[PDB]
Symmetry: D3
Subunit: 97 residues, 6 copies
């Protein structure tokens, strides 16, 4: 409801989004190369090495998935806060498994 | 526009969402096991045996699909009404085929 | 922020959505038949030969993807403007490759 | 060892070949359309509606499998006997499930 | 029956094997990259740029297919003759489409 | 040519067959679960825990591959010797990677 409450909820949703991707990618119904690639996309995003548009483009290619029109703006508004909250990307990845 | 109008529109969208899943799963371009599994997820959701977060987690795994950040909150706001409107889950499934 | 600003942003997002579909479909990690089919869906949509609901239904089938509850309303609000802006659908397709 | 013994062994192998195809196709890890199509190929072959080369060509397409250079000659030498031994193709299919 | 008759039959089978691979790869149920790759394997084999063991290893990887124990020796005995018979590999490929 | 020479050649072919399966399964274009499953099939076969017919049935299911009529008899004639030659199945698997 407040801007602050909205921000915090977006952050939690975005954590859940990235951690689900890792869980899916790491499930072993998936190719070992895909899993490493999704882990690396998520880590680079979290480390600020890539930005939302390029992460989503590469993700759709990696998973052979279809585009989501609200996904980039969601990420763009959540990532600055989540990043400040997520000082160790490797540990986040490890924790999502 | 009104809260009531928004609610009704969410319900119709959510019906269309679940009925599309069934149609896709039942098309015969899909594995017979997947189809039975998606039917069972949809029925359990509609019967209140599972909730939105767990349904979506299992669905992404079943279809090997990618996460949708707005999907859980969409479902959470639509399902209470749709459920009261959908007294027979088996008939809903049957009707979506 | 203004209605006009919102409209223009929706149009750009929708261009990016359709052009990403074409890029994905044309990448050569995909079946030649799928690519031709996605190109044809996108062109028909842009030419007003099909509408948002039918385009999305057919797309989910073609790519064996999962439904997106906010996708149809997104398209419905963006397409009238994008269409007036996109007088040559073949050139749009060609440009997205 | 004798020609007669070789013939009988080829027939049993060919029964096992066609019944395995049916079992695989009917397992529900497969698309419902594929299963119906493989069942129909096997039945037509057994009923003499199609011959070995055309059956194998269509099968490779249906299962998206790779060619087997010894498969056609195997089938050609086994099928005349197996067919005389297999007066009801529907029952064979049913039995292999 | 004679060695000469056996040789000629092996050659025809091997032509049919390689031409089927091309037909399958070129059908458009397949990825554009796979098709180009299978075409290139077949051409290199026919041009003597690669030998039977390496062609089959790469093919199994490209099509994600399973190994065939009699395939290499089949190819090894057929290829020397087929190659002398097949002075233009590009035309063979073109003809198999 | 001699029975002894034929036996030794069958053994080498069968080693190459099983080691290729492991290489394919371990390439990381494959699901982590598939790889573990193919490794376990190959080890059980080599350890005499399963026999040729059951190994091939399970393999076709695991890789969603098509049946090979000459595969079981090939394995049956090769395995007794290869097994006596292959005192450590884990090391064979490890070596094929």
């Amino acid at each position: 409801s407040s801007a602050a409450t909205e921000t915090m909820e977006n952050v939690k949703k975005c954590k859940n989004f990235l951690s689900t991707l890792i869980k899916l990618a790491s499930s072993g119904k998936q190719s070992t190369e895909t899993a490493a690639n999704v882990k690396e996309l998520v880590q680079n995003l979290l480390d600020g090495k890539i930005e939302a548009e390029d992460f989503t483009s590469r993700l759709y290619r990696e998973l052979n998935s279809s585009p989501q029109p609200y996904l980039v703006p969601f990420l763009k508004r959540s990532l600055p806060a989540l990043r400040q909250l997520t000082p160790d990307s490797a540990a986040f990845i490890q924790q999502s498994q």
